[PDB]
Design a protein around this ligand. Structure first.
Ligand SMILES: [Mg+2]
Ligand SMILES: [Mg+2]
Lengths: 181, 201
DNA sequence: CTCGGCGCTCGCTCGCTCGCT
DNA sequence: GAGCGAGCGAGCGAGCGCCGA
């Protein structure tokens, strides 16, 4: 398994759940999700271009925070060296503003932000390990959890199913537990 | 507001000999009547080369920039090591991304026209001012305050000559009491502005 | 003193711009 | 038109001095 970049996108504050989902449609907010579906889809479209990675592994999760909606994008680093992630990410940020926001930049502070190895300045683009998904994304539960997308086989059935998340989390803790022997 | 590129050109202390007529040796400079400078401290032959450099640089600038009437301020100086010219030219018509290629056009022309195709020995004789002192910054844009801040304060013998089409510095180029006046006037504003900022928390 | 996060520097990277041929 | 390539400069990030704990 490869490393991942994390880009977090804040989203300003009629879908169906797939048959296999156990989630509560009543707790998923329609309007913000529609914005998020465009952002993730278009991000990944541009991502595939700059990285020359048509099959790029990704996991995206849309969450409802205490102050704003935020979307975690995890893309495989293959094809995009850390040294050039910035110049490519700025191209993508611009596409979104044009395609989704009619070319009016969102008011939201820090609304499109890569995850660095440090809080201040001078850090590096963080290569997030894939265990980030069970350790930190899978355990989210409604209403905080709002939606998720992936092309990673392990998580197809997990995106929108709370039981399957629960299982994979536990499957992970077991594996962790196994290495400690 | 007008922004300015800054090119800095070194001039040597040097088919030019005193044993025969030539465009450098033959020139003799007078101060305009309004000037309070000391002509004995101004070096005639470097001055003469320096005048030709800035003159030609400018007309080549008006070509690439497609901007006749482009604002400029140029000042020739005698330093510890070399003579040098600070050329300030308005950015209009030249996007920073293409300054280089145009500056190299001009640099080559000056080498052919003034140096007869023999590239100057001097180490970094034609260099544009960047936003950082090392590699990888952009071409610097300064505003007019750079003139009262860093060029007007010079006195002789460091100050040799100045040329400008800028209304406000016409009389200052070669009048020292004029420079002094404008420097005080500027510093006063800068000082009040400093106070005002400190008091604005 | 030790410790550690933060602000910041600077040699360096490398996809992009665009006048030129 | 096509595409070369010097010049571009935002981005990078290990390293380090500072400062409050
Ligand atoms: Mg999270
Ligand atoms: Mg000087």
């Amino acid at each position: 398994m490869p490393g991942f970049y994390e880009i977090v996108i804040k989203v300003p504050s009629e879908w169906e759940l797939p048959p296999d989902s156990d989630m509560d449609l009543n707790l998923i907010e329609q309007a913000p999700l529609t914005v998020a579906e465009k952002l993730q889809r278009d991000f990944l479209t541009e991502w595939r271009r700059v990285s020359k990675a048509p099959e790029a592994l990704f996991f995206v999760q849309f969450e409802k925070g205490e102050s704003y909606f935020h979307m975690h994008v995890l893309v495989e680093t293959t094809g995009v060296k850390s040294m050039v992630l910035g110049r490519f990410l700025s191209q993508i940020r611009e596409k979104l503003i044009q395609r989704i926001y009619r070319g009016i930049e969102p008011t939201l502070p820090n609304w499109f932000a890569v995850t660095k190895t440090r809080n201040g300045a001078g850090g590096g683009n963080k290569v997030v390990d894939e265990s980030y998904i069970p350790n930190f994304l899978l355990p989210k539960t409604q209403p905080e959890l709002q939606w998720a997308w992936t092309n990673m086989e392990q998580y197809l059935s997990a995106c929108l199913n709370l039981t399957e998340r629960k299982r994979l989390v536990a499957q992970h803790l077991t594996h962790v537990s196994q290495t400690q022997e």
